Each structure stands twice: as structure tokens, then as C-alpha cells.
């Protein structure tokens, strides 16, 4: 039995066992649409045509937010399919293939954003990948075509492989580069004049690690807590998974707030226009 067969089964398994919870998650998903469609559109409008700068971070955030937009749009697509086209399980592949842009291709995008920050702040590379948007496009296409190599796997007609390769490994390299930036931005000898943006950078970099340890950890923890430790009932297996998909999709609403909206350099464009 394929994994996405089980996903489509679990989508309507709580319908009937916990129907009020199912409508509560209906409302939560609708609110996530409401708060993540206009926000992502405004971020794209202020970040594509309102900015005349071409550096890796801007283009990285542009592609991060377009996958955010696509996963946001595919969020009330599984529900529309499951409410209007009941049945159609292998028929409705994009409703599960919205996992291509969440727990996939949106973890590596944050990862490469963090390594870009490490390469641009302390610069332990020399050439910094020779800068230029060309290497940014190369890395973006790399991750776009590497998320396919792991989304095609795992759910083939393997569960612990996705957690160990796509969650533990990007988190390890994110937490080891954020920790390096904290040491570099707190070296003794720096001027006591810029310690208001050098401490907001510390706060704005530890925040995005906490969001990673809240949005994406409960789904991947459960997905290894079912195969390895099967002593848990289907009632708890079903309510935990269905509540740790909105937390995983809560990153969609919390992505341009931390990466696009608190940036005071580009925040004045929205507030000035």
C-alpha cells in the first residue's frame, strides 16, 4: 500500500470519529488561506517589482515565497477534492503532492537561505560562490529537482528515510550555521554603536530556528513514532497527524512575516506606499 493511499485514507478517517474537529480544521485551513494568500501576494508585489536589487537573498526569498503561494493554494484543494470528488484517490495526486512544497522544497529553501546568510556575514568561503544571481538560480534549480528525487521516493508503491534525510539533516546544518553566525556577531572587539541591529539579527535568526522547531517537527516526529513505536492507538495516530499538518502549514503564514515583513530595509516600501 502506497503512503499517499494512507494519507488520503487519513484525510477522511477523522470524519465521523471527530467531526467537530474536522470542521474546526476546516475553519483553521480557511483562516490560513485568508492570512497567507494576501500576505504572500503583497510580499511578492513588494519583492519583485518594488525592489531594484539583485542579490542571492532577494531571489532566494522570491522562490521561497512562490512555493509558499503554491502550497497555500493547494491547501484548500485537498479539501475541495475530498468534498466534491469523493473517491478519486490515485486520481487526486496534487492534493497530496502539495507535500512537494512543504516538508520538501521549503525546508531546503530555508536551509540555503541560512547558508547564504553564513556565506555573506562572516564569509568563510572567499569567493562566496562567486556571488551573482547565476549561482542562486543554480541552487534553486538544484533543490527544485532534488525535492522531486525524494517526493517520488518514500511514497512509492522508506518512512524513516524521509525524516532522517530531509528533516534531521537540514536542521543539523541550519542549527550549525545559525550557531556559527551567533559567535561571529558576538566577537569581542566590535564597536558598541551597532549593537542594536547586531542584536536584532541575533533575535531574527534564533526566531526562525524556533519556527522550524514548531511548524515542521511534530509531523516528522509522529511519522517515525508510528513505525518504530506501534504501541499507540489509531485515535491518537489520527488526531496528531491531522493537527500536525496545520502546524506544518502555519509556516506558510509565518514565512513572509519573518523573512519579508520585519526587514526594515524593505518594510518602509510597504508602509510608504
Amino acid at each position: 500500500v502506497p503512503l499517499f493511499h494512507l494519507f488520503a485514507r487519513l484525510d477522511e478517517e477523522l470524519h465521523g470519529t471527530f467531526p467537530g474537529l474536522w470542521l474546526a480544521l476546516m475553519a483553521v485551513h480557511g483562516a490560513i488561506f485568508l492570512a497567507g494568500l494576501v500576505l504572500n501576494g503583497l510580499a511578492l508585489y513588494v519583492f519583485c517589482c518594488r525592489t531594484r536589487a539583485k542579490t542571492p537573498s532577494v531571489i532566494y526569498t522570491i522562490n521561497l515565497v512562490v512555493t509558499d503561494l503554491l502550497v497555500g493554494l493547494s491547501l484548500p484543494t485537498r479539501f475541495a477534492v475530498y468534498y466534491g470528488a469523493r473517491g478519486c484517490l490515485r486520481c487526486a495526486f496534487p492534493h497530496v503532492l502539495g507535500y512537494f512544497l512543504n516538508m520538501h522544497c521549503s525546508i531546503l529553501f530555508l536551509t540555503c537561505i541560512c547558508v547564504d546568510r553564513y556565506l555573506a556575514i562572516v564569509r568563510p568561503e572567499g569567493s562566496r560562490r562567486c556571488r551573482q544571481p547565476a549561482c542562486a538560480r543554480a541552487v534553486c534549480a538544484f533543490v527544485w529537482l532534488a525535492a522531486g528525487a525524494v517526493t517520488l521516493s518514500v511514497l512509492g508503491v522508506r518512512v524513516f528515510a524521509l525524516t532522517v534525510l530531509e528533516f534531521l539533516l537540514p536542521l543539523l546544518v541550519i542549527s550549525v550555521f545559525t550557531g556559527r553566525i551567533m559567535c561571529a556577531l558576538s566577537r569581542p572587539g566590535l564597536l558598541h554603536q551597532g549593537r542594536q541591529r547586531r542584536v536584532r539579527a541575533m533575535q531574527l535568526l534564533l526566531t526562525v530556528l524556533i519556527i522550524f522547531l514548531v511548524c515542521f517537527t511534530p509531523f516528522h516526529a509522529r511519522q517515525v513514532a508510528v513505525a518504530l513505536w506501534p504501541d499507540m492507538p489509531h485515535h491518537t495516530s489520527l488526531v496528531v497527524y491531522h493537527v500536525a499538518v496545520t502546524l506544518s502549514s502555519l509556516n506558510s503564514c509565518m514565512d513572509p512575516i519573518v523573512y519579508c515583513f520585519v526587514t526594515s530595509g524593505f518594510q518602509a516600501t510597504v508602509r510608504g506606499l
Partner: antibody
Amino acid sequence: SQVQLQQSGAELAKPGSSVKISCKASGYTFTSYYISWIKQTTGQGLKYIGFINPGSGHTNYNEKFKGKATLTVDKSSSTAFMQLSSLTPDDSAIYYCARGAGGFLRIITKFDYWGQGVMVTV
Amino acid sequence: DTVLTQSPALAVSLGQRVTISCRASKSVSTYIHWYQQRSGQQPKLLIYSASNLESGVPSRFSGSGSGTDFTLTIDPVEPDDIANYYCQQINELPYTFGAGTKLEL
């Protein structure tokens, strides 16, 4: 053709055996309606056995009958197969299968048409 | 599990309105079906969602009530109306049928 749910004929049963019950649906798209099974006994009323989606394959059982009955669906001929193991003398009853429509505020709303009933005596 | 209790067999006369109540263990709002079962025949559908009729059935029988305790009224009785009437709870996934009522002259 109008919607119908044809059932297998009457079958004889013995203790410590197994039985199969087959339902075939016509007149509508099978994968767009759930197929449910109910048990009807002479002494008491009726007890709902379970249901299953023909297309998704999501099977749900009653807690009393969980594990006792096994549900399968073959979509080539639109057949729902209900398998009973370790037949008991008190399991002598009439098994019905019903078409269910997927609603909005609940998973299922209408059990509109049933079958003619499959009588099993142990 | 919501155990459903039903009214017992009630004697009726020809050309007289009758009403039979079915009770529930927990609140169901408006989520109970009403069925009739003829003598030795397949049980057929009468009322869905306790307030609506389907497939052009006659309007002489109708359900009523909200919340926990429900009723159905049939006016008047018919020669083919002598049947066992049943209530399905639906709000909770394990569905339960009623005890049953019989109509006699």
C-alpha cells in the same frame, strides 16, 4: 437503469467455519457512494456492521465486530466482499448492504437503498 | 455509544392519526433517519434527516423533533402501513437502530 444492489443467495453455515457475502451495485457510479454493511437479527433489532469507500478503500468497522469481519471491494465488477471467520450459532442473521451518500457536515448522510438480505443460519 | 430507545407497539384504528417517539442517549440535533420495514420484506426508506421526504413518497408520514427525543406522525394509517419503524442515529460513527414499534388494529 435504476440503482440496485443485488446480493448473493441464501447460504448454509456451520460452527468453526467462514462465510463470504457479495454485493453488486448498478445504476450509479460505484466509487462516488460508500457501501455499508448491517446485521439484522430475529431477537433484537439491527446492528450496524461497518462501511467502506469503494474508491478510497477506507474501511470502518463497529467496535463489537472489529476484526471479526473483513471488508474488501473489487471495482472491476463493482463488488463489495464481506468475510466472516469463526462463525458462531448466535451469528445466524441476515446481512444487508446499503449505498451511502457523502455529505458535508458529516461523513455520510443518506442510507437510501438496501439489498434484499443475505440470510445465514449456523 | 448512543443507545436508541423506541416506543413499543401501539394499537391504532383506521382513519386515525398516530405518533410514535424514539429517544436517544445523547444530543443528536437533527441527525436521525426514520425507516419502515414491511412484514417479511426489505426495510425501505421513509424519512432522511428527520424532516425531509424523497423520491415522491406520500406526505402522510413525517418526522419531527430536534435535539435528543424525536417523533414521527403518520396520518392516517393504511393497510400497507403496518410495519416496524426504526430510527438511525448518525452523528456518532457507530450507528444504532431503535427498539421498534408495531401498528395493529
